[PDB]
Amino acid sequence: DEAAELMQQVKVLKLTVEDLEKERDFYFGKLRNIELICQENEGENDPVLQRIVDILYATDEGFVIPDEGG
Amino acid sequence: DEAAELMQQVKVLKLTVEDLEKERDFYFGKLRNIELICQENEGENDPVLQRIVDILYATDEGFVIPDEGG
């Protein structure tokens, strides 16, 4: 049935959403603590902190960076 | 209409899915490079690397850790 697929879709999407945003939220909360940790230990800017800032700043074209202008 | 909401749901869920998994994927790919970077610089296990491993290992109850048993 038409709506049977549609409602099953929201099932799969609910599931994908719950799988997705559960990790998106958890992973992102983790990311918030790494950024300020870089400024907590910039001072001693060891290689890891040079390659993980590269990590944090892994932006590319098509991707949005906030506070763009410096 | 019944299916009109349902198909609009998959719209919103598609949108949420695309917003979600685009970040879930991007953020997680970033996370893959931090974990091995910790073992790249464990040797010199500075505070950052003690607090970001806490980050990477921010697990709790209800959350699954792979390779559980050591």
Partner: peptide
């Protein structure tokens, strides 16, 4: 914390 890390715009 300093909102410079890549995002989407979204909302």
């Amino acid at each position: 914390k300093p909102s410079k890390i890549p995002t989407p715009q979204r909302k």
